[PDB]
């Protein structure tokens, strides 16, 4: 006689959980997550912004890195998200409890975050995390300002309904640097065609390829750094091989077209 299976934890490649010291991207922007998951700290005179936190177990590491940057828990003002999957929004509930931070997200991302990633359109309950509430709902193109840095939301639905690119202008060498943190454009294991839970999935992805292509984008970063050819473990040449937003979108579209053809054949 055979029991039901044990719950299966969401396990990931070791590099996704490998701590790294803060890596500066521009004057006010740092990568503070792990070697293979992005978490961006943007430091302003009036407090800090975090874009993504990575996995649930990364919360204390993020706070240690924030401390090393001179940002105390009370100084963290705002959390923004690429998308509300466990490997990017994982520690958000805990960060809210341990810091001053409030969350701003679009309605789709807010709804998914509030169910801790459960009943995912594609993953079901396979990949979940502690639920958190959004404090502010943003609309497409809406801006949020913290200590004079202005962040713009660009909706790029597909990977999740609420997938979002965030853009802001930092400086490097007295010159402006237009940073584009573009969300994932993957569809890992997704049913793309005739998906009853996401009927216009293909059209949304196609629109999202165009959105990403057109972002203001001197430097592209992505939640999975490898998608944009970043190597956080490579120090001074971490960003050297980084893709443009144009090249990222193109590569994603080509991958997506191949996946569509494979699905039709499958
Ligand atoms: Zn400044
Ligand atoms: Zn995801
Ligand atoms: Zn991911």
Curated annotation (Swiss-Prot):
It is an enzyme of class 3 (hydrolase). It catalyses: a beta-lactam + H2O = a substituted beta-amino acid. Its EC number is 3.5.2.6. Zn(2+) 1 binds at residues 83, 85, 159. It comes from the Bacteria. It is found in: Periplasm. Unstable below pH 8, unless zinc is present. One of its GO terms (biological process) is antibiotic catabolic process. GO terms for cellular component: periplasmic space. Binds 2 Zn(2+) ions per subunit. Residues 1-11 form a propeptide. The keyword Protein transport does not apply. One of its GO terms (molecular function) is beta-lactamase activity. The keyword Electron transport does not apply. Inhibited by Hg(2+) or Cu(2+), and by chelating agents such as EDTA and O-phenanthroline. Reduced enzymatic activity in presence of cobalt, nickel, cadmium, and manganese. Its cofactor is Zn(2+). Substrate binds at residue 183. Belongs to the metallo-beta-lactamase superfamily. Class-B beta-lactamase family. Confers resistance to the different beta-lactams antibiotics (penicillin, cephalosporin and carbapenem) via the hydrolysis of the beta-lactam ring. This is Metallo-beta-lactamase L1 type 3. It comes from Stenotrophomonas maltophilia. The lineage of its organism: Bacteria, Pseudomonadati, Pseudomonadota, Gammaproteobacteria, Lysobacterales.
């Amino acid at each position: 006689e055979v029991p039901l299976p044990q719950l299966r934890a969401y396990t990931v490649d070791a590099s996704w959980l490998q701590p790294m010291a803060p890596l500066q991207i521009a004057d006010h922007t740092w990568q503070i997550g792990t070697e293979d998951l992005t978490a961006l700290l943007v430091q302003t005179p009036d407090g800090a912004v975090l874009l993504d936190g990575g996995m649930p177990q990364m919360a204390s590491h993020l706070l240690d890195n924030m401390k090393a940057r001179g940002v105390t828990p009370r100084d963290l003002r705002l959390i923004l998200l690429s998308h509300a999957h466990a490997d990017h929004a994982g520690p958000v509930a805990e960060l809210k409890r341990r810091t001053g931070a409030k969350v701003a997200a679009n309605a789709e991302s807010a709804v998914l975050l509030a169910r801790g990633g459960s009943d995912d359109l594609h993953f079901g309950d396979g990949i979940t995390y502690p639920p958190a509430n959004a404090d502010r709902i943003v609309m497409d193109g809406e801006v949020i300002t913290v200590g004079g840095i202005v962040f713009t939301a660009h909706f790029m639905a597909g990977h999740t309904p609420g997938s979002t690119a965030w853009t802001w202008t930092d400086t490097r060498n007295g010159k402006p640097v237009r940073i584009a943190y573009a969300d994932s454009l993957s569809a890992p294991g997704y049913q793309l065609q005739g998906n009853p839970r996401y009927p216009h999935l293909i059209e949304d992805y196609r629109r999202s390829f165009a959105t990403v292509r057109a972002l203001p984008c001197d430097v592209l970063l992505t939640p999975h750094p490898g998608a944009s050819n970043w190597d956080y473990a490579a120090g001074a040449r971490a960003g050297a091989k980084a893709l443009t937003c144009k090249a990222y979108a193109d590569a994603a579209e080509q991958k997506f077209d191949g996946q569509l053809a494979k699905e039709t054949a499958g």
